[PDB]
Amino acid sequence: APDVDLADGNFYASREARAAYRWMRANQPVFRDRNGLAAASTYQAVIDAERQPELFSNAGGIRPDQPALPMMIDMDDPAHLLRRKLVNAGFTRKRVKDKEASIAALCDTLIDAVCERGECDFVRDLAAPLPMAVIGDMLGVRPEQRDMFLRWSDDLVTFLSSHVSQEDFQITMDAFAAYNDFTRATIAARRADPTDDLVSVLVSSEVDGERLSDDELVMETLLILIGGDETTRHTLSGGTEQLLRNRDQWDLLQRDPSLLPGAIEEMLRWTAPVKNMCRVLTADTEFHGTALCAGEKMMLLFESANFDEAVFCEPEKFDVQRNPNSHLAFGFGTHFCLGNQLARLELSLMTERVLRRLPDLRLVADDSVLPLRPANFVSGLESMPVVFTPSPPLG
Numbered sequence: 001a002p003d004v005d006l007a008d009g010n011f012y013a014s015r016e017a018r019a020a021y022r023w024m025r026a027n028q029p030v031f032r033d034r035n036g037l038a039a040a041s042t043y044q045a046v047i048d049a050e051r052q053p054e055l056f057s058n059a060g061g062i063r064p065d066q067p068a069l070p071m072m073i074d075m076d077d078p079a080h081l082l083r084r085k086l087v088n089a090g091f092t093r094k095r096v097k098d099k100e101a102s103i104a105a106l107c108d109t110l111i112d113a114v115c116e117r118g119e120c121d122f123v124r125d126l127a128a129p130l131p132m133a134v135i136g137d138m139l140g141v142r143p144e145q146r147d148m149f150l151r152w153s154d155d156l157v158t159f160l161s162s163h164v165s166q167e168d169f170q171i172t173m174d175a176f177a178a179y180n181d182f183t184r185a186t187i188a189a190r191r192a193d194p195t196d197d198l199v200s201v202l203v204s205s206e207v208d209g210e211r212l213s214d215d216e217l218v219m220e221t222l223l224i225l226i227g228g229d230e231t232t233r234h235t236l237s238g239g240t241e242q243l244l245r246n247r248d249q250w251d252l253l254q255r256d257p258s259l260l261p262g263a264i265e266e267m268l269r270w271t272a273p274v275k276n277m278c279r280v281l282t283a284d285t286e287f288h289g290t291a292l293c294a295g296e297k298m299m300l301l302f303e304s305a306n307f308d309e310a311v312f313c314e315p316e317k318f319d320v321q322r323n324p325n326s327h328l329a330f331g332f333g334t335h336f337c338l339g340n341q342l343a344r345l346e347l348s349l350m351t352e353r354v355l356r357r358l359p360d361l362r363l364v365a366d367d368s369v370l371p372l373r374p375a376n377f378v379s380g381l382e383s384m385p386v387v388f389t390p391s392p393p394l395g
């Protein structure tokens, strides 16, 4: 039995995690770590828990050692559903498709800033900035404010770990206080001068039949923000790395663009930026072999599910043509990712431009293994130095 702490961010930065997952799925599908924390590791157990929200609740909060906050992802139905339908319309496949030109322009702009150099950090220069700009435009973040909001967002999720230092914990709290002050100013201004963005939509929203409190407005806005700017970035970087480490996949996708939809799904399965989500049990229950107590939280291990040999043949092989590919990177059930269509378009347009404008893109050193972020919620590549043949900007 692996001696691991599933709340320790270092576990998810270690490249031993998938070996630990394999042991869980084979010996104790609903695993208990060294501290007794329960975690569903099989595709089956995760699905079954997602399908029983009355037993596996979100109302205790989605994080292990953290109370629930006034945001829809920390809510059960009917309260959660009333919130989601306040922002549902703008995230449909058809409404997301309308933003194609805008997102494409952002992609080309970000590649223009490095194309003359012949080298860059794919994470810092392309993967991270693109979704920041996209969700920022939806939330009302000004372009000159993007880097600041992303710095706050980084500080909010980078140090989530049972082994967080006192100093790092203070960085997280300071960033939330900073975000809190700025956004409360924005919330009031959107009440005096309503605009088109999402914050303005929530500010003027009503739930049977009262307006949302300022505490909720701040938290719902943060939910959308972090969902946008701390997730897709990791599928971009980690998925592009798989194309670069298996250039037969890069080549295959290069000569046939119609394979891009399937490639995006395999990137999502492989990277699984959200490593887990918590569920609180409303009653004692025997769940797929493991006794669970009322009031304790069980983790849904999305990456473990995404490599479950019971569902995916040769899951350690990256195959852009993988069909079926019913991965659980976006989860399942009533909390199924709101921005799943937005994220897929972000990944498709950026990858399409990387293949076209950086056609000979390579890792600086294919031998070295790239470091992962030691956090217990969302995690991905810290950096990704790349090289390519320079080209003139498009303007």
Ligand code: HEM
Pocket (backbone or CB within 6 Å): 050, 072, 073, 074, 084, 135, 223, 224, 225, 227, 228, 229, 231, 232, 233, 235, 268, 272, 273, 274, 277, 302, 329, 330, 331, 332, 333, 334, 335, 336, 337, 338, 339, 340, 342, 343
């Ligand atoms: C690769 C990119 C993304 C991944 C892997 C991802 C993953 C997830 C996961 C695992 C959940 C919880 C599902 C569950 O517990 O079953 C979720 C929910 C959510 N995500 Fe995403 N997400 C991504 C991108 C985005 C984007 C771009 C947005 C932009 C708004 C977003 C907004 C949300 C929201 C608001 C929820 C809460 C939905 C609810 O509780 O009803 N996410 N996401």
Ligand SMILES: CC(C)CCC[C@@H](C)[C@H]1CC[C@H]2[C@@H]3CCC4=CC(=O)CC[C@]4(C)[C@H]3CC[C@]12C
Pocket (backbone or CB within 6 Å): 063, 066, 073, 156, 157, 172, 173, 176, 222, 223, 226, 227, 230, 231, 378
């Ligand atoms: C769609 C997913 C990415 C969900 C995103 C959830 C985000 C909004 C949640 C997850 C962890 C949360 C943080 C957990 C730690 C914390 C404790 C506090 O005392 C202040 C608020 C903060 C600083 C929380 C702010 C909101 C966060 C960052």
